[PDB]
Structure 1
Amino acid sequence: SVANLVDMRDVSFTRGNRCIFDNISLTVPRGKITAIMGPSGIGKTTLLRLIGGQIAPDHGEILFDGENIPAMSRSRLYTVRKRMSMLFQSGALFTDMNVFDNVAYPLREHTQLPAPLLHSTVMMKLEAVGLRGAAKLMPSELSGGMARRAALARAIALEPDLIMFDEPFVGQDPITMGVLVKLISELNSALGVTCVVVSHDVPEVLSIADHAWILADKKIVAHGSAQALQANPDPRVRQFLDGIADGPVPFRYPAGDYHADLLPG
């Protein structure tokens, strides 16, 4: 078996005349939750599209379960994509179908399972998102939060090995925000789904993540636990997390080597 479901090694990406990523390397450990954070417009969505093989990197290797995606043939890529699901914010629901049929579409297209069971499954997945009573409603009849939540419910319908969420918590009240955080956590726990979460709702995503990566100035500036980041003195990391420049380090007393604390000698 392979420890990192996604393994980016020395990846660079340039769009037109402007550089987006400069020789970055990160890992998405299998069965865990990885958060990817950073200032707006730095191309985190582009990073997710890179992992999904939708875009190709200029240089470097993107290993999915060991296989270099940019080096894969098209048929091989098509079959490997079946283990992935991506929720984009630009993506929209089918306007001609209601909420229920929108969430049922992936299941009817790839699940090939009995209609009573499919019905129960779509009802459960609507309950996980708080839209069960809105099954009949059309997308035009939906508010922003409801529509985003419906897109999310469709994104988790097939429960593949890897799910990538692009800002799953935006446009929601804080209680619904917590409900969605719980959704990602319990999905990962019960099914072993490897989750990559892109979010500027930093406390929320850090409350569930196993690993976190911060991106700035076309590179990776930090990674580690929430405790590690709270004790990181780097001005860019502090500027992003605290929102203010030249503020204090919240965890003022940094910690020593953890392996040495646990296993002295």
Structure 2
Amino acid sequence: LQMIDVHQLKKSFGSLEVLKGINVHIREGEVVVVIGPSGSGKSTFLRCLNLLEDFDEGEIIIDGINLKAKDTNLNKVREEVGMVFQRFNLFPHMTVLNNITLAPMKVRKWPREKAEAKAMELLDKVGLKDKAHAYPDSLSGGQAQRVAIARALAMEPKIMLFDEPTSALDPEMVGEVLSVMKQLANEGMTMVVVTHEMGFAREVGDRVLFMDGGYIIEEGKPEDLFDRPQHERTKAFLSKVF
């Protein structure tokens, strides 16, 4: 039924409880956009979904695989979840092409040639096939972020997580990244995107999750939550940032 099933997820960092009982259902092929004030645990939530973070209480089931089960291979689960961070996504001492074939070649044992062809295909999809042999330090922010997306997709994941991938870029470079993300959404990839770009949220998001202080205060279709919020805290957040 769901590609991502989260039940009463709780997470603390010592004395500080960040996630206070998150409940989420995301269907395969759905694009879920997460918004909310800072410190609400948006990034922490993504990190949990990417297995970069252990969790205290709750249950997380990815593609029918409970992360707490005996027979669960967490590295295998980590193979089906791709993630793009706000900033440093590439190894600097590696070329674009090699950054992309590294995991597929190691993890999925693809021969160097099967990996590189797939990488050239993803580079073309993001419009940077000509940068295959360049190093990250020579890319613009917008180009590096697109390559970061190609790299994550090279593992052919079932889910793609995005933690404010454009929040850092200058306005000129924002579109080229969102454009790739939109293209990716039209392809049926299950996506979870933390972002402040409400235009992208409305246009390509299937559902929006309003996270505030460790809780999902409201949930709903973009149109319904942005223009018909049902909770004052939601209207509050939406008004102040407008």
- Specify whether residues 78 and 29 from structure 1 end up closer, same or farther in structure 2 by C-alpha distance, changes over 3 A only: same
* Alpha-carbon contact 1:167-1:200 (below 8 Å) kept: yes
* In structure 1, C-alpha distance between the alignment counterparts of 2:180 and 2:136, rounded to whole Å: 22
- Specify whether residues 175 and 123 from structure 1 end up closer, same or farther in structure 2 by C-alpha distance, changes over 3 A only: farther
1:210 is matched with which residue?
206
* Alpha-carbon contact 1:178-1:204 (below 8 Å) kept: no
Matched, 1:241 2:206: no
Could you tell me how far 1:173 is from its partner in structure 2? Answer: 5.2
Most deviating of 22-31 and 105-114: 105-114
* In structure 2, C-alpha distance between the alignment counterparts of 1:242 and 1:90, rounded to whole Å: 28
* In structure 2, C-alpha distance between the alignment counterparts of 1:188 and 1:92, rounded to whole Å: 21
TM-score (norm 2): 0.86
* Alpha-carbon contact 1:36-1:214 (below 8 Å) kept: yes
Deviations 1:114-169, CA, capped at 9 Å, x for gaps:
72x54443223223333333333222223333322222221122221111111123
The equivalences for 1:50-129 within 5 A come to: 50-69=48-67, 71-73=68-70, 76-109=73-106, 110=108, 112=110, 115=113, 118-129=115-126
Gapped runs of 5+ residues in structure 1?
Answer: 248-265
* In structure 2, C-alpha distance between the alignment counterparts of 1:197 and 1:15, rounded to whole Å: 23
Please identify the structure whose Cα radius of gyration is greater.
1
Sequence identity of aligned pairs in percent? 30
* In structure 1, C-alpha distance between the alignment counterparts of 2:170 and 2:128, rounded to whole Å: 15
Q: How many residues align?
A: 240
Could you tell me how far 1:175 is from its partner in structure 2? Answer: 6.4
The equivalences for 1:1-265 within 5 A come to: 3-69=1-67, 71-73=68-70, 76-109=73-106, 110=108, 112=110, 115=113, 118-172=115-169, 176-190=173-187, 192-229=188-225, 230-232=227-229, 234-244=231-241
* In structure 2, C-alpha distance between the alignment counterparts of 1:43 and 1:77, rounded to whole Å: 22
* Alpha-carbon contact 1:159-1:193 (below 8 Å) kept: no
* In structure 2, C-alpha distance between the alignment counterparts of 1:76 and 1:122, rounded to whole Å: 26
- Specify whether residues 118 and 12 from structure 1 end up closer, same or farther in structure 2 by C-alpha distance, changes over 3 A only: closer
* Alpha-carbon contact 1:213-1:220 (below 8 Å) kept: yes
* In structure 2, C-alpha distance between the alignment counterparts of 1:103 and 1:67, rounded to whole Å: 27
* Alpha-carbon contact 1:202-1:241 (below 8 Å) kept: no
Could you tell me how far 1:213 is from its partner in structure 2? Answer: 0.3
| Letter aligned with residue 57 of structure 1 | F
1:261 is matched with which residue?
none
- Specify whether residues 242 and 151 from structure 1 end up closer, same or farther in structure 2 by C-alpha distance, changes over 3 A only: same
* In structure 2, C-alpha distance between the alignment counterparts of 1:7 and 1:155, rounded to whole Å: 22
| Letter aligned with residue 41 of structure 2 | G
* In structure 2, C-alpha distance between the alignment counterparts of 1:186 and 1:128, rounded to whole Å: 9
Could you tell me how far 1:4 is from its partner in structure 2? Answer: 0.7
| Letter aligned with residue 222 of structure 2 | A
* In structure 2, C-alpha distance between the alignment counterparts of 1:129 and 1:171, rounded to whole Å: 19
Question: Which 4+ residue blocks in structure 1 deviate beyond 6 angstroms?
Answer: none
Gapped runs of 5+ residues in structure 2?
Answer: none
